[PDB]
Write a protein that binds this ligand. Structure first.
Ligand SMILES: [Zn+2]
Ligand SMILES: [Zn+2]
Lengths: 49, 142, 9, 177, 177, 140
């Protein structure tokens, strides 16, 4: 969740950077992860633990 | 004909300004190919950073060490985690004590270099202040 | 240009 | 939350229990629990009227049926029965019948490629995981009455956690450098 | 060199051999070799009587005992039985029994903390390392008859190279400067 | 407290006589703290030669280059190494013209002017206790 966007790229087998351009996933970005529905559930569980 | 160059830098260097600008300068002005840890994360994952680092170190025709951020563009330096700089420095020290392939290593800086022992050790390699030494650095690569 | 995503397991 | 109706066909509600005498007291309560929760439990004590006609036929009726779920009530005496019941000083008829049922279960288990589709070991209070027959240790071992909810789920043939269908892929973005 | 006595207790000279039917001839040769070298080997074809009394009890007798060492005869058919699909098992009972023995070996291996104290895989002439079951690949894989000496050493629970007791610390001399 | 001094030399120099005499000479006459590679070998193993050498160069208050044996003491004459690396570091300092005051040159036998010594010519040269008095004055 501090690097999860990289984790999802590893899962998708995609490079995050390339010559002169960058690849991003909007929803899975840190703040967007926090704002996501399931992201809130994960955040709550982590805070509880 | 093509030529390939490896780039090293600590995490302190801002990627968005300094590294992007330097990569584009290398690709266009210097007429060379750039190898970066950012671009080959899949290969790093397969090999592991140490093996990948050594592979690039032996494979690369030239190696560039960047010790300070750019000044041509104003940045806060942010755009806290383990990086390859200490390992790259150890491998460079191995090569230096071997006193072989010393030509490959080149030191590049824009802002004044910090007062650190590792940088002094790297200072043994040729220096190029790209604020003024763009053409000389390009010739060195070519 | 973004590459095409695919479902993964 | 929300409530889901149980749509299990009645023929799948059949259950058969094998045990030893030390557990009989607790097994009575276990059968009370199962019958109350709608499962048709077949245990010798309640079936004695029909079982008495032909004991071996009665056992074989449940051992043949693939849809019948068998519950193995583990206990210190159970291991002794299934391993050396005939070695006892006196002949324990129930011990021998338990041993025979265990052999039939093992034979069916091997025939299926060592896949345990319908044998549910249950550790009763005075039982320890060591008493579980080795081949049964390769599956979930429930402890009664601690895990009775899980036992009911297993008998209903439902998973405690059910995943949703695979969701949509996220948005992919490109940013020039 | 010099000769020396062998001091393995007879109770630890029991060896059990599991295999697939394709290696039957080489397995018989291997059993001859082991018996001639003084190891009490248990194999189905030679113990067919006691095994005939009760097959599953016979297999369990050797799987329970920790002192018994089990030698796994690897072959293309062994992995096909133990790990392969069950549809092929509809034509072979010995395949089912080998699969059951493999399951029991896995259960023991996990039960011992994933440490292989007594399972000794062996590669037979028509075998490859790919045929070894995965969990067995984690330890030494011998080949027959190439490494029969190593196999005998392993069964004796000896080590080919043995270190002497640690010697006295060397003398240190001091010199001024 | 004393002042720290670093000693550099090639392997061609007789270590025992010359270096031990120079160590006692520094400790007693020069009121200085001596850094030598033989003792630092324990620390060199942890840090490594190059990094350790750079750290000592950056930390030492003075740097001493010894280029000849102490022929005044009877010796057999022979009773890769760090020196090329140290010389390259000093050359980098010279071309950067930084911390030049730290470096000093010492010789007992007549100094053969090696090609590398041309760069070392910047450092003051001292011979025996006669010039050691001025060396002590320089240190203090
Ligand atoms: Zn920036
Ligand atoms: Zn000497």
């Amino acid at each position: 969740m501090d690097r999860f966007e990289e984790v999802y790229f590893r899962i998708q087998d995609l490079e995050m950077f390339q010559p002169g351009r960058m690849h991003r996933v909007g929803e899975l970005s840190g703040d967007n992860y926090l704002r996501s529905p399931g992201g809130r559930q994960l955040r709550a569980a982590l805070d509880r633990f | 004909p093509p030529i390939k160059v490896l780039v090293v830098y600590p995490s302190e260097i801002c990627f968005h300004h300094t590294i992007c600008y330097f990569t584009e300068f290398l690709q266009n002005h210097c007429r060379s190919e750039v190898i970066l840890e950012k671009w080959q994360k899949k290969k790093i994952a397969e090999m592991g950073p140490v093996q990948w680092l050594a592979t690039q170190k032996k494979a690369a025709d030239k190696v560039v060490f960047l010790l300070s951020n750019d000044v041509n563009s104003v940045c806060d330096g942010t755009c806290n985690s383990q990086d390859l700089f200490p390992l790259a420095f150890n491998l460079f020290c191995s090569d230096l004590r071997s006193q072989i392939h010393l030509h490959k290593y080149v030191v590049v800086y824009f802002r004044e270099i910090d007062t650190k022992d590792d940088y002094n050790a790297l200072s043994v390699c040729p220096k190029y202040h790209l604020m003024k030494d763009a053409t000389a650095f390009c010739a060195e690569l070519l | 240009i973004p590459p095409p995503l695919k479902p993964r397991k | 939350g929300t409530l889901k109706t149980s749509n299990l066909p009645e023929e799948l509600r059949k259950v058969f229990i094998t045990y030893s005498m030390d557990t009989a007291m607790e097994v009575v309560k276990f059968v009370n629990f199962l019958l109350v929760n709608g499962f048709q439990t077949a245990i010798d004590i309640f079936e004695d009227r029909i079982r008495g006609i032909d004991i071996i036929k009665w056992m074989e009726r449940y051992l043949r049926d693939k849809t019948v779920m068998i519950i193995v009530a583990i206990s210190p005496k159970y291991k002794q029965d299934v391993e050396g019941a005939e070695s006892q000083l006196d002949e324990d008829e129930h011990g021998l019948h338990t041993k025979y049922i265990h052999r039939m279960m093992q034979i069916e288990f091997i025939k299926q490629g060592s896949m345990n589709f319908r044998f549910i070991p249950v550790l009763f209070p005075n039982a320890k995981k060591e008493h579980v027959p080795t081949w049964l240790q390769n599956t979930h071992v429930y402890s009664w009455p601690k895990n009775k909810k899980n036992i009911l789920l297993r008998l209903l043939r439902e998973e405690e956690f059910v995943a949703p269908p695979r969701g949509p892929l996220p948005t992919l973005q490109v940013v020039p450098l």
